[PDB]
Design a binder for this molecule. Structure first.
Ligand code: 5GP
Ligand code: 5GP
Ligand code: MG
Ligand code: MG
Ligand code: MG
Ligand code: MG
Lengths: 181, 178
């Protein structure tokens, strides 16, 4: 007899990624970023990696990632969208989730008009099945099936971003909030 | 005789508050906020505590504090820089002259919130150009330029996990780089 314990949060049916396994994946991604940008000569002030964070849900991912990137010797400067002369500089766009990729595609092609030295993308949650156009992020922290999630910046009607984990809400959450007139 | 160990950062003379030291104070502030908003019936979706974060340096302090508030049963929704009838908590990374924070508070009281308070990570009392007091303060700092935990020196060093004081050679070297 399989014993399935109840979800840790009384508002969710399942926890997909905890804060701990998110950070460890990010410490792995940071090492790759530190290796790839090794030949770019990144220094604070003189030549930092321009982190372009896509508001709003990316603020949690951006806060943890730049501190983790700093542990691996990757100096950064942050910019928020939805800016700054990125001409000649290295740009790394950060999104909390990558679903249809229509937003990330428009932002990347926009920043390339200013001609940066290079430009890649790092997403915390990749939702590959929900894509409308072909798009691959250079760096992906974790992958999720085609199910709506919240937490770690991701929201449901601007709420539950504070959930430290990426979880799946109960259906009763949507109807209890739908019944509110 | 007295010996002073080297700072753990090659770019800083001093480390004022560490990441763990800030988090401990933030959990202490979170317990007070949960007590002050105890009878407000805060709840996700229906009536969350509207967090107004003052870009840019506050994004680190906003990401950490918002999660800590969740641990203490304080549901929040984030805004970055309507609240009519909602409780508002303005978050700012550092409170120095208070000119920016006073204008934001007075701009938000136009929409008539249920209540509005302020929470700053770093309070710099001796820097005020006008009298102003934040309801919640994580830590205090003397009148000295600091960086880290979102605070920047020319858009850099925000990623430093602790609130440190840069060496004068950092200002001098970057200053002679024109
Ligand atoms: N919280 C959350 N947001 C998502 C998820 N998948 C896509 N999104 C975001 O939700 C928005 C899509 O709008 P919608 O399809 O709800 O009208 C986009 O901003 C997209 O990035 C998810 O699984 N969880
Ligand atoms: N990094 C850092 N920023 C500060 C400090 N004190 C004030 N600031 C910020 O610096 C700006 C004012 O600097 P100023 O315009 O005088 O160069 C304001 O945004 C203010 O909040 C500090 O000690 N460290
Ligand atoms: Mg959205
Ligand atoms: Mg959303
Ligand atoms: Mg500054
Ligand atoms: Mg400033």
């Amino acid at each position: 007899h399989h014993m399935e314990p109840a979800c840790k949060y009384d508002f969710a049916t399942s926890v997909l990624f905890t804060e701990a396994e998110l950070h460890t994946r990010m410490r792995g991604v940071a090492q790759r970023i530190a290796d790839d940008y090794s030949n770019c000569n990144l220094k604070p002030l003189e030549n930092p990696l321009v982190i372009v964070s896509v508001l709003k849900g990316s603020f949690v991912f951006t806060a943890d990632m730049v501190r983790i990137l700093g542990d691996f010797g990757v100096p950064t400067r942050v910019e928020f969208l939805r800016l700054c002369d990125i001409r000649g500089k290295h740009v790394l766009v950060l999104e909390d989730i990558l679903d249809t990729a229509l937003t990330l595609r428009e932002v990347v092609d926009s920043l390339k008009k200013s001609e940066p030295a290079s430009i890649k993308t790092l997403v915390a949650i990749d939702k590959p099945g929900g894509r409308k156009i072909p798009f691959t992020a250079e760096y992906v922290v974790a992958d999720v099936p085609n199910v709506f999630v919240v937490g770690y910046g991701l929201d449901y009607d601007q709420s539950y971003r504070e959930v430290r984990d990426v979880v799946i809400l109960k259906p009763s959450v949507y109807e209890t909030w739908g019944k509110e007139l």
